Paper text:
Roundabout (Robo) receptors provide an essential repulsive cue in neuronal development following Slit ligand binding. The Drosophila and vertebrate Robo1-3 are most similar, containing five immunoglobulin (Ig) and three fibronectin (Fn) domains in their extracellular region. Here we present the crystal structure of Robo1 Ig1-4 and Robo1 Ig5, together with a negative stain electron microscopy reconstruction of the Robo1 ectodomain. These results show how the Robo1 ectodomain is arranged as compact dimers, mainly mediated by the central Ig domains, which can further interact in a “back-to-back” fashion to generate a tetrameric assembly.
The Robo1 Ig1-4 domains are arranged in an extended conformation, ∼170 Å in length, with essentially no polypeptide linker between any of the four domains. We obtained similar Robo1 Ig1-4 crystals in a different crystallization condition with a c axis ∼10 Å longer. Although these diffracted to a higher resolution, the Ig1 domain was disordered. Otherwise the structures are identical, apart from the βC-βD loop region of Ig4, which is better resolved in the higher-resolution dataset. Nevertheless, four crystallographic contact interfaces are observed. The first results in a dimeric arrangement between 2-fold symmetric molecules along the b axis, and is primarily mediated by the Ig4 domain. This interface, which spans residues 378–394 and 429–436, has the largest buried surface (663 Å2 of each molecule's surface area), and is predominantly hydrophobic in nature.
Residue numbers in the entry: 64 to 447
């Protein structure tokens, strides 16, 4: 008794790389043994059973076996879908079609990741598209040759993008996009991420007051990435010809300081990412000068006298009074100890009210600051 031929096992679709071996899944039974015929949509295919010189092999189990896939620029007949057919003494059989496409992966990337230059805390985005390949390559990233993961909340690898919400100095490095499939791995062109820092001050110039022909030093020190260029400037005008120097540490030194050196001097730290400035004032000290000097006076007993004494100077000088041959100092802001008939105004004058005979004498006005001291006096004569 003879049974009609029919396909028992159906072959499934599979992809194989160039040169790599591939095997199908075809099986049929009948009486006598059915010969499995392989044809690429009508066209005949060479096998080991038909000719002993052919490269393509034919297994007696039923499934077709290939050693090396024929593909190139001149000849490529191996690629294409094939269906096995069984034939016995009586009856015909046809199996389901299975895809037998050759797998490939190109050399150059459709989109190479680009270099990014950002300041600390600013986001960083890198984009990539792997080379043309079947099956379509899946993206992954590498930082300094080491694989990168989504684990860190700041880094998200979705689609063809690598995202960093805010950068840390630790984010700097050489980034490479990687395209992988069954064929292999493809690394992209190096995309370097540089995390820069704006300039800021390590030391800020401080306010200074000096006397004429002294020296003035203003200190400055900055940080940053790239290392900044520290430069001095005088705001009202220029730095003094033949009289200044900037030391290696960035100190500003003005020798033999004159009145025309009084003002604001700025220190400027600059790099590619930004600029930062810090100012400080120079106060040139001047000794005091009498504006109004007291005049000798004659006053009737019981009446009020006022000896005027006003002084200019930088800084504004302290004025005080005292009677010749006495230690009791009379100030404006201070309550007068001995008598309340004596008082110094906010501007320096000395008012004596209800003058008595013991008030006779010299009243000394003294003005002083850090740059000098000046002293003057006027006589009080008390008459009947």
């Amino acid at each position: 008794e003879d049974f009609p031929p029919r396909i028992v096992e159906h072959p499934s679709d599979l992809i194989v790389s160039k040169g790599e071996p591939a095997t199908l899944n075809c099986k049929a039974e009948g009486r006598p043994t059915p010969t499995i015929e392989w044809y690429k949509g009508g066209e005949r295919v060479e096998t080991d059973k038909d000719d002993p010189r052919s490269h393509r092999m034919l297994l007696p189990s039923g499934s077709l076996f290939f050693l090396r896939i024929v593909h190139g620029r001149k000849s490529r007949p191996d690629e294409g879908v094939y269906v096995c057919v069984a034939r016995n003494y009586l009856g015909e059989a046809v199996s389901h079609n299975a895809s037998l496409e050759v797998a490939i992966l190109r050399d150059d990337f459709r989109q190479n990741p680009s270099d990014v230059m950002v300041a600390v805390g600013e986001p960083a985005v890198m984009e990539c598209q792997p080379p043309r390949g079947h099956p379509e390559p899946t993206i992954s990233w590498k930082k300094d040759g080491s694989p990168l993961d989504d684990k860190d909340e700041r880094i998200t690898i979705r689609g063809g993008k690598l995202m960093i919400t805010y950068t840390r100095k630790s984010d700097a490095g050489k980034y490479v996009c990687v395209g992988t499939n069954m064929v292999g791995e493809r690394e992209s062109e190096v995309a370097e991420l540089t995390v820069l820092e704006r300039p800021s001050f390590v030391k800020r110039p401080s306010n200074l007051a000096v006397t004429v022909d002294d020296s003035a030093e203003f200190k400055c020190e900055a940080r940053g990435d790239p290392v900044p260029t520290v430069r001095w400037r005088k705001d009202d005008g220029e730095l003094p010809k033949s009289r200044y120097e900037i030391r290696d540490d960035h100190t500003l030194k003005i020798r033999k300081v004159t009145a025309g050196d009084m003002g604001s001097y700025t220190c400027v730290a600059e790099n590619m990412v930004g600029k930062a400035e810090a100012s400080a004032t120079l106060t040139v000290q001047e000794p005091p000068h009498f504006v109004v000097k007291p005049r000798d006076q004659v006053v009737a007993l019981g009446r009020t006298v006022t000896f005027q004494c006003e002084a200019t100077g930088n800084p504004q000088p302290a004025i005080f009074w005292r009677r010749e041959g006495s230690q009791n100092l009379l100030f404006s802001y201070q309550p007068p100890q001995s008598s309340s008939r004596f008082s110094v105004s906010q501007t320096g004058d000395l008012t004596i009210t209800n003058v008595q005979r013991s008030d006779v004498g010299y009243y000394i006005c003294q003005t002083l600051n850090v740059a000098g001291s000046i002293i003057t006096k006027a006589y009080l004569e008390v008459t009947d």
